[PDB]
Amino acid sequence: LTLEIPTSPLIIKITQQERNILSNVGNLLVKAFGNYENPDYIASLHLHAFQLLPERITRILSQFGSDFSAEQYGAIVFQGLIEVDQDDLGPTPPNWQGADYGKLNKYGFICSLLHGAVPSKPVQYYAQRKGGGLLHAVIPDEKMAATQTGSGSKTDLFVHTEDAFLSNQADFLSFLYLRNEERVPSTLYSIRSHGKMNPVMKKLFEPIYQCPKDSGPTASVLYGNRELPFIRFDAAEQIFNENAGQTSEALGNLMDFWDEAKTLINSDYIPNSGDLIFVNNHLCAHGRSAFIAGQRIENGEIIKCERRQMLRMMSKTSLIHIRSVTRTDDPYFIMEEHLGKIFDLD
Ligand SMILES: [Fe+3]
């Protein structure tokens, strides 16, 4: 049988009963542990994940965790994982620093269980908001509108795997949409959409590429299995950056790759409130189209709306492997700065 090349993510329609289970489990964990960063909760995370998640989610995520086959896209859309009460959530804060984690506590529990069922362990990075906790609120900040960050809006966020500049980048990501009233499409790009290993892709296994953090060590864009590889890629940071410092050969290879890759980008899915996108950060890159925060256009008219709000959680399947880059007193806190180099604070 000829290979069925994946061009889009797996879509799971979460049922009302599953949504009810998740809500009650979220509430129980809040009462039992206070918050999702409780060391007793984190230490018994996988036990809580397999015992408390709706069983179909547990089966999906378990299958996904160990699936690096030719058929695997590397992303799952869980449609309507949660019901967001928009009025209780109230207005979106001016930036991520104004997020009410007391209100997002239950969501943090739900997201950590999803990672826990992979199985994978939520982690935080000093490279991202000086850690900023296991759960990040991704909000369009008017001051950062034209930036190539999660606090951006007016500009296209070109496809990238999270933290391509780190040797210990996240294994898994979850993006929980609380609101997307601007109807911003989610953009995904899978290395598996290319199909069979070709000459353009083979050049990416060479450890000759700059992975700029946002004289420098170089890394491979493709790694892992030679036939069915893993990817570390950031189009904006490695290609569309004058200060990337790529060699003539490396830039050519990346340009050739980008030409082939850009035709495979999937921007079909527009997330709704309560959808969660779950990603294997070694298989699938993500991005977001340009938008004006707090508005959408319908019939050539501007409809004012509440500003985009999404929750991001990152995880690693092994605490052992990352142990030389984590805090002595916190094996879930990654202190890596750039491709092996650790942040030198004092
Ligand atoms: Fe990202």
Residue numbers in the entry: 17 to 230, 241 to 372
Article excerpt on this structure:
We have focused our work on the iron(II)/α-KetoAcid-dependent Oxygenases (αKAOs), a mechanistically diverse superfamily of enzymes that use dioxygen as the oxidant to catalyze several reactions via C-H bond activation, mostly hydroxylation. These enzymes operate with three substrates, dioxygen, α-ketoglutarate (α-KG) and a primary substrate. One of these, KDO1, catalyzes the formation of (3S)-3-hydroxy-L-lysine, while five others, KDO2 to KDO6, promote the formation of (4R)-4-hydroxy-L-lysine.
The structure of the apo form of KDO1 was determined without iron in the active site, lost during purification, while KDO5 retained the iron throughout. While a ferrous ion is present in the KDO5 apo structure, it is not the case in KDO1 apo as the metal is lost during the purification from the KDO1 preparation used to grow the crystals.
